[PDB]
Symmetry: C2
Subunit: 104 residues, 2 copies
Amino acid sequence: KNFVITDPRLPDNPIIFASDGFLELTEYSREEILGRNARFLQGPETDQATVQKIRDAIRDQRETTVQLINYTKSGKKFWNLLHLQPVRDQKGELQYFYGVQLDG
Amino acid sequence: KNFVITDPRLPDNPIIFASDGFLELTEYSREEILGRNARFLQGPETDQATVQKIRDAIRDQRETTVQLINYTKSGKKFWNLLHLQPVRDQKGELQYFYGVQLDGS
Ligand SMILES: Cc1cc2nc3c(=O)[nH]c(=O)nc-3n(C[C@H](O)[C@H](O)[C@H](O)COP(=O)(O)O)c2cc1C
Ligand SMILES: Cc1cc2nc3c(=O)[nH]c(=O)nc-3n(C[C@H](O)[C@H](O)[C@H](O)COP(=O)(O)O)c2cc1C
């Protein structure tokens, strides 16, 4: 399926893992996206209000589900039904976020 | 939904990441399973022939999809539709495996 993992402890919360499904969805290769913040999928018609909700969820370190317009590598639009989830270590400190993406 | 990631560069290919869905499916906690090979989900009625296929796929470092009986922590049986996928680094060396579990109901 389609999922990624980011490290919020790294500069700009970059993707450190992406499934093959994510690669197929976005048309990007693994080498092209590792180490980058997932926001590169956003564009002109992406709703900023929804991005803010994502930003608030990340700050508050809570799970969230939103729906927003993303763009493929070739410039094709798709609605991304995005589910985010924080992962904590054994000491209860924030360690990762994981996201599950769905093409509408 | 349900997925894990293992590290084949570590002894016994242990789980190093698990989604909340995986935790809910198997009734195990995150601390309980990190650092362990995923084989603990197998039990009495698990078909060894299927286990052998998985082992072959991991050896060959290719993706595979099987269905097999697994067990929750409490011992409840469930059909696991399991998909495995190898992941390589930029130099082409095997770096991870990821697995996706679907409950067959
Ligand atoms: C694990 C994870 C996966 C994400 N996946 C996407 C995505 O697929 N598409 C998208 O537009 N934003 C995604 N985001 C959100 C962006 O990375 C970023 O956090 C969001 O645009 C708000 O941050 P910003 O205001 O600094 O851009 C994801 C975030 C996380 C933590
Ligand atoms: C990423 C990954 C996920 C796996 N998930 C499961 C699983 O959910 N259930 C299961 O019975 N085996 C699963 N396995 C297979 C076992 O970890 C192990 O490879 C299999 O039992 C064969 O090894 P063995 O014959 O030495 O026990 C998974 C393997 C990998 C690499």
